[model samples]
Target: SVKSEYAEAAAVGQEAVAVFNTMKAAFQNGDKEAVAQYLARLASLYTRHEELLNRILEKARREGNKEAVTLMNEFTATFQTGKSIFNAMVAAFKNGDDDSFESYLQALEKVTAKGETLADQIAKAL
Candidate 1:
C-alpha cells in the first residue's frame, strides 16, 4: 500500500504550511492581490483535503477505526466551513480598504493558528 495511512493527511498539512508561508511573503510585499491569490490557493487546497478525507473515511471504515472515522467527518465539516471564509478573504483582499485589510489579517491569523494545529495533528496521525 502507501508508505503510511497518514500520508494524505501529512500532505494536507504541508500544503497548508506552504500556503501560510506564501501568504507571509505576500504580506511582506504589501501586494493585496498576491495575498488574495495565496488565500485562494489555500482555499483550493482545503477543498482537496476534503476530497481526500472522503477516501480516508472509507479506509477507516474498512480498518474499523471508528474514532478516526468520526474525527474525519468532523474535520471534513470543519474544513468545509473554513473554506468559505478563505474565499471571502480572497475577495476582501481585492476589494478592501486598509481597515478592511486589517480585518482580513485578523481572520488570516485565525487560519494560521489553526494551521499550526493541523500540522501537529498530521504529525501525530502520521
Candidate 2:
C-alpha cells in the first residue's frame, strides 16, 4: 500500500509527467522557450520524486515483499531511462544543436511512450 506521507510525492511525479507533456507540445510546435520552461520544471519535480520514491522503496525492502521490490526496481530502471532522455534533450537545446535536438526529440518521445505503457501496467497491478 502507498503511504500517506508519499501522497505528495506521487502528486509531484504526476506533475512531472504533465510538465513533460507540455514540453512535448512545445517541441512539436517549435516553441523553444516553452520547451525550456517545461523541461526545467520536470527536472526539478522528478529530482524530488526520485528522493521520495527511494524512501518508499526502502520501506518496501523492510517488509520483504519480493514482488513489490522487483516492480519498484523496474520503475527505477524506466525512470532512469526517462531522465537520460531528458538530459539529452536539455543538452541539445542548451548547446543549440538543431540536429541533435531532432534526434533527442524522437528518443524522448519513445521514452515517454514507454513510460506511459509502464504506468498503465502499474495501475493495473494496483
- Give one digit per residue, the lDDT tens place, for model 2 in 1-126: 555635666688778767877787787788988888887887888798888778766776888866657777788788788778778878988997878977887886787577656554443333
Error of 2 at 1 (Å): 6.0
By summed lDDT, which 10 consecutive residues of candidate 2 come out lowest?
117-126
lDDT of 1 by residue, 14-121 (tens): 788788777867776787777767877777777776677677767767878766666666666666556666666566666765566566657756854664455444
Error of 1 at 91 (Å): 1.8
As a whole number from 0 to 100, the lDDT of residue 98 in candidate 2 is: 73
Number of clashes in every candidate structure?
Answer: 0, 0
lDDT winner among the candidates? 2
- Each prediction's Cα lDDT score? 0.65, 0.75
